[PDB]
């Protein structure tokens, strides 16, 4: 089976450039060279992310879109940058803005019919594709409405395949934008009902989890868009190795999304460690299952400890005892039964791959579908009502051909999403 990535926008082209900088190394795949893989296994299931053209030369099966060259060139004229075929790029010299309405209408559109054309050239790659990987941010522009216009047009041609997304929801404290809430609400409006799995990422948490779980002093984005990559990595790809009980986006969505809402998640890593300082790391399963469920170390600033759990799905990887996994995932389920919902007798959906992170023994990607993501899906929504009762930057959207009802729509759409989420946290 094969998956296809679509890094949309600077952010996504930034997050991706770091994702493909992890899923790459994890396969021993130099900038454009080849399978200089340490293992002889890091290359049989690559048909999940790569393609086979110049034989020795692979092509990460993913497209990159945008509307302000200033970032894509950063990528390609940068490190790993060169390895994705040229055409594999899509963008415009148009006014990117931070207008969702511009990425999903006046401009974002006139770029999709060429981005859609691209993807299929890949969708028609070969064998049964599993689904799509779309990384982006819900507060900027070329990624929010521009992405949304895609996942909502991708389904139009792939109603079968599974719809993924590691959407960067606006951090709880400091937005790197102004019209944060706008691009947001308007964005998920499309995801909440075009995706079937969405790992919400908080640019802040990744800070908290880099300054406190680690003790890094100048945490730049390269670190951040790593961190993400780890989980984003684990979940998919990684899961397509030999597993003493392997899983994949299918079974994940099939175990991770109770009701149709596609529902959004929260990635968590387990073996995070403080630089050369923390050697230690006896790394068992309880210390791996220890981190994961911890009230911090979770990518979204939401508090797992602030709402129940629908279906946790810790993905293990690195030769270990099932006997303890269950035990460990059991004792965390019991000694902590408080946040695990009773209408799902056995939430946890264990998965134990075999090969682990290169210089690592045991790992534990996480994917909780807690009713704690109602803490942000509320957040990014309360900020909206605000700037709307004063029709704030409304005219950067309108002017770009839009409506005052669509802002009503999207919100109310993305608003009950908090409601149906409260319909289980209780």
């Amino acid at each position: 089976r094969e998956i296809v990535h679509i890094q949309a926008g600077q952010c996504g082209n930034q997050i991706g450039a770091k994702f493909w900088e992890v899923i790459s190394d994890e396969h021993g795949i130099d900038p454009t060279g080849s399978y200089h893989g340490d293992s002889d296994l890091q290359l049989e299931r690559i048909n999940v992310y790569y393609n086979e053209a110049a034989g020795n030369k692979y092509v990460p099966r993913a497209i990159l879109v945008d509307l302000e060259p200033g970032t894509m060139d950063s990528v390609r004229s940068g490190p790993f940058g060169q390895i994705f075929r040229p055409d594999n790029f899509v963008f415009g010299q148009s006014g990117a803005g931070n207008n969702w309405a511009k990425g999903h209408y006046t401009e974002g559109a006139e770029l999709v019919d060429s981005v859609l054309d691209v993807v299929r050239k890949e969708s028609e790659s070969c064998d049964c594709l599993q689904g799509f990987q779309l990384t982006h941010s819900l507060g900027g522009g070329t990624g929010s409405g521009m992405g949304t216009l895609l996942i909502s047009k991708i389904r139009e041609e792939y109603p079968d395949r599974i719809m993924n997304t590691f959407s960067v929801v606006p951090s709880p404290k400091v937005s790197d934008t102004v019209v944060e809430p706008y691009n947001a609400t308007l964005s998920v409006h499309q995801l909440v009902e075009n995706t079937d799995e969405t790992y919400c990422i908080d640019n802040e948490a990744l800070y908290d989890i880099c300054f406190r779980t680690l003790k890094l002093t100048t945490p730049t984005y390269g670190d951040l868009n790593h961190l993400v990559s780890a989980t984003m990595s684990g979940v998919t790809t990684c899961l397509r190795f030999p597993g003493q009980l392997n899983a994949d986006l299918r079974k994940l969505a099939v175990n991770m999304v109770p009701f149709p809402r596609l529902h959004f998640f929260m990635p968590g890593f387990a073996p995070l460690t403080s630089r050369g300082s923390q050697q230690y790391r006896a790394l068992t399963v309880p210390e791996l299952t220890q981190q994961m469920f911890d009230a911090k170390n979770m990518m979204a600033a939401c508090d797992p400890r602030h709402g129940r759990y629908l279906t946790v799905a810790a993905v293990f990887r690195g030769r270990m005892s099932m006997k303890e996994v269950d035990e460990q995932m059991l004792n965390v389920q019991n000694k902590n039964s408080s946040y695990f919902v009773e209408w799902i007798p056995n939430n946890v959906k264990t998965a134990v791959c075999d090969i682990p992170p290169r210089g690592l023994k045991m790992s534990a990607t996480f994917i909780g579908n807690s009713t704690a993501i109602q803490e942000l899906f509320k957040r990014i929504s309360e900020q909206f009502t605000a700037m709307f009762r004063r029709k704030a930057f409304l005219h950067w959207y309108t002017g770009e051909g839009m409506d005052e009802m669509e802002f009503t729509e999207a919100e109310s759409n993305m608003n009950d999403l908090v409601s149906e989420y409260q319909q289980y946290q209780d």
Binding site: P242, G243, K251, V257, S321, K323, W343, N346, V348
Partner: protein
Amino acid sequence: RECISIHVGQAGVQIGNACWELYCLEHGIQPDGHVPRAVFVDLEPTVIDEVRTGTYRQLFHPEQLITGKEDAANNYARGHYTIGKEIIDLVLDRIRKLADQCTGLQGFSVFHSFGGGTGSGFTSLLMERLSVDYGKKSKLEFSIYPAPQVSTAVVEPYNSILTTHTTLEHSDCAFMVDNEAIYDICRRNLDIERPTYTNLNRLIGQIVSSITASLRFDGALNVDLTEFQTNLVPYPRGHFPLATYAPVISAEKAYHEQLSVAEITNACFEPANQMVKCDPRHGKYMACCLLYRGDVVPKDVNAAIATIKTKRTIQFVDWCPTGFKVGINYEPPTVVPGGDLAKVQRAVCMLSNTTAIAEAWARLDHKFDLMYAKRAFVHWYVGEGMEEGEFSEAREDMAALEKDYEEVGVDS
């Protein structure tokens, strides 16, 4: 005279790859030194592929190794209807191909595992397609029953309930085998807290390399599969016994095996070696099937029981005066050269049918309620082509397997 084996879903292809590993092992014939007699199937490659890419890879013809490049996905309704069909008729073909290829076969051994995808729903329409193409034969299947707590998939119950019901009315006998129950033996009767799946399946091949292999051998009173169900299953219900074993010894904690026929026989009926977490918390065996193999004498066996029995707190059904279809092979076990099974001269395989599974059935069913009571993952099925009925029925169905596995017994 021949027994066909079917191995489906990771479990199925797993548990089995371990029973089919001790097999040749105790038949002195290395990796490629005759030919097997089964057929593996999945709708998610990698697992099956993890066979045909390693040990034993060459002890099976790629024809048998049916495999699907679709998406297994832990939803019953996808392995049965939607995608299972995409490869099923192809399997029926393989099987028949193996069916006609012999001198009057017997039954089938469908190793799989309830709580999953390909093993749950798929097998379901394998057995249906079997039992109505072989009514004149027997259909035994190893029901790896979804653990009582230490689970995995979120749907676990859904899959099962539907699977068991759409199979019951087909197979003739289902040997339950729990995952935890075993664990709770690899820490008690083996002293190892690193029990990998590779071990839980080796302990299956230790209770499987009997029921058949053994039986099919010469000794005291040979026991075919036919005798099993004829002596093991009281009524039409494909009644599902719960495999057991007594010489369950820690090949480094118990420095003693010379533990005479009696003592092991006592072990079997202890609610510890049970392969299923179905502690006889009421259960009244309706018909055990103690299978001795090796250095066991027809009078020592015919004595260990004339007390296991008169132990009374052993409590046997009312209606069954002598429920002990004994079996006695000549060859003892043949432990994996480096496993943890100290290996011994004698060994039972006690695979009884007790008013015990009446338990897990219940719990593993009550889980179904809580879920289905909110539909939970339901759509993940209906989309795959299903109706609110299936779930409805495959429940009312169980309701009966309740109003039956408690009825027949409990009352005298």
